[PDB]
Structure formats: C-alpha cells, structure tokens
Amino acid sequence: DIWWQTYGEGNCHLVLLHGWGLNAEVWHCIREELGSHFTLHLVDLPGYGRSSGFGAMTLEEMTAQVAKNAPDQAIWLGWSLGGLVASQMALTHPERVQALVTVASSPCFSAREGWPGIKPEILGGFQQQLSDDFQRTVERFLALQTLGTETARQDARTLKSVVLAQPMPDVEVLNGGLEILKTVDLREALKNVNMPFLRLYGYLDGLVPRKIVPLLDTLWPHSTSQIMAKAAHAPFISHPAAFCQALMTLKSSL
Numbered sequence: 703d704i705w706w707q708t709y710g711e712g713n714c715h716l717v718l719l720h721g722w723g724l725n726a727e728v729w730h731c732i733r734e735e736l737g738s739h740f741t742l743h744l745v746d747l748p749g750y751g752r753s754s755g756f757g758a759m760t761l762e763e764m765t766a767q768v769a770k771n772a773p774d775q776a777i778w779l780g781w782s783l784g785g786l787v788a789s790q791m792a793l794t795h796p797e798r799v800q801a802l803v804t805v806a807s808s809p810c811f812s813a814r815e816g817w818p819g820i821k822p823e824i825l826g827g828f829q830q831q832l833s834d835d836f837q838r839t840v841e842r843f844l845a846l847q848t849l850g851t852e853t854a855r856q857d858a859r860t861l862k863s864v865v866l867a868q869p870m871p872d873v874e875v876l877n878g879g880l881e882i883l884k885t886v887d888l889r890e891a892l893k894n895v896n897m898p899f900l901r902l903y904g905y906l907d908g909l910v911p912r913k914i915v916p917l918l919d920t921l922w923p924h925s926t927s928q929i930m931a932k933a934a935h936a937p938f939i940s941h942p943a944a945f946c947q948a949l950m951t952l953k954s955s956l
C-alpha cells in the first residue's frame with residue numbers, strides 16, 4: 703500500500719508530493735508553519751520511501767495509485783517529479799483538485815527543440831550509472847538541486863539525510879522515475895486545466911531552468927507564476943517563509 707500521513711488541522715486540505723529519490727520527510731521543515739492553515743496529506747510516491755512493493759511505473763500508472771487513498775478534495779502541490787504527478791492528477795480528476803501547485807518542476811524536464819531543460823543523455827547517464835554506482839549516483843543527482851544558494855551546503859545535507867534515513871528503493875523504481883522525467887511532456891495537456899494553477903520556481907535552479915517561466919506564462923495563459931530570487935531547486939527548504947506566503951495568498955484567493 704502507499705504510505706500516507708495526515709498532519710495539521712487547517713481548514714483547507716493540501717497534498718504534498720516529493721521528488722525523485724526522496725520521500726515525504728523533505729516536508730518536515732515546513733509542517734509546523736503550514737499546519738494551522740492547511741490539513742496536510744503527505745505521501746511517499748509508490749516505490750519510494752515507505753511505499754514499498756512497487757516497481758517501475760509510468761506517470762499514468764503512478765498517479766492512478768496515488769489517487770486511490772488521497773483525500774477527496776485538496777490543493778495538490780508537487781515538487782519536481784512530484785509536480786508531474788500533481789499535474790497528471792489535475793488532468794485526470796479535476797473535480798478532486800481545488801488548485802494545482804508545482805514547485806521547482808517542469809512539464810517537460812528534458813531539453814527539446816526550442817525548449818530549455820536537461821539534456822536527455824544526462825538523464826540516461828544517471829539511469830545507466832544506477833546499475834554499478836547506485837548510492838553515489840542517487841546522491842549526485844540530488845547534489846545538483848541545492849547549488850548556488852546562500853544555504854547550499856546545509857540544504858544538500860538536509861536532502862542527503864532524508865535519503866539515508868530510510869532504506870534505498872529498488873533500482874527498478876529509481877530508473878523508472880528518471881524515465882518519467884526524461885520522457886514526459888505535459889506542455890500541451892496542461893493548456894486545458896481550468897482550476898487555479900500556480901507555478902513556483904527557484905531563480906538558481908540548475909535542473910529546471912528559469913527560462914521556462916515566461917515561455918509557460920505564455921503557453922498556459924490561465925496559470926500564474928512566481929520566481930524566488932535566491933532559491934535553487936528546493937525553495938521550500940532554502941526559503942520556507944516565502945514559500946508559505948505564496949500558499950497563504952493562494953488559499954485566500956480560492
């Protein structure tokens with residue numbers, strides 16, 4: 703079964719989805735601040751963290767499992783890979799999604815024609831590297847997410863601690879997750895979501911290039927965006943106050 707946790711007692715439900723190679727413990731730093739304003743629903747994505755017994759899955763397969771024991775109605779907030787899951791949830795069960803929020807996430811992580819992103823050969827390299835250098839490879843992908851910030855060292859340690867505090871997922875699971883990043887492109891599909899859609903980014907993010915923000919402001923006219931100036935790929939860790947404020951403003955606007 704998929705591991706779900708409820709935290710807090712706020713009058714708006716908020717689902718929080720973590721990124722690749724991690725688990726819901728990444729949200730520990732913002733729980734207290736958010737818990738009076740939201741009831742939080744924290745999930746370990748299938749195959750990750752405490753959600754054992756799953757193998758490689760496509761985004762479609764993964765989201766359908768996450769949906770099973772998710773709350774009836776909530777804001778859905780996804781970080782990085784979690785942002786793809788939240789997006790797919792908005793596309794499949796719009797009546798269950800009060801608002802879609804992505805944080806440091808792209809609808810298409812891989813660079814393509816006219817589209818900034820990660821070279822797909824780089825993601826393929828990480829996949830290949832998992833076979834013989836499993837632990838360091840996971841850590842090397844995570845190490846990219848905190849660079850250039852005021853709190854880079856501390857924040858990289860935070861993510862590494864999250865990884866090390868639980869058993870490692872199966873290589874199959876991790877390889878499959880990179881395949882989702884490498885192959886999924888939700889740019890066209892997301893034009894059609896009609897609930898509030900807020901996209902948060904870190905200016906210094908080395909995985910999700912800030913150049914995509916104006917491209918998507920134009921491609922997705924119903925959506926809105928905010929760039930945190932001094933944050934990289936984990937803005938809720940480096941800048942929890944600004945992150946929480948964005949969610950307050952969203953909550954009031956529903």
Ligand SMILES: [Cl-]
Binds near residue numbers: 721722781782783784
């Ligand atoms: Cl990710």
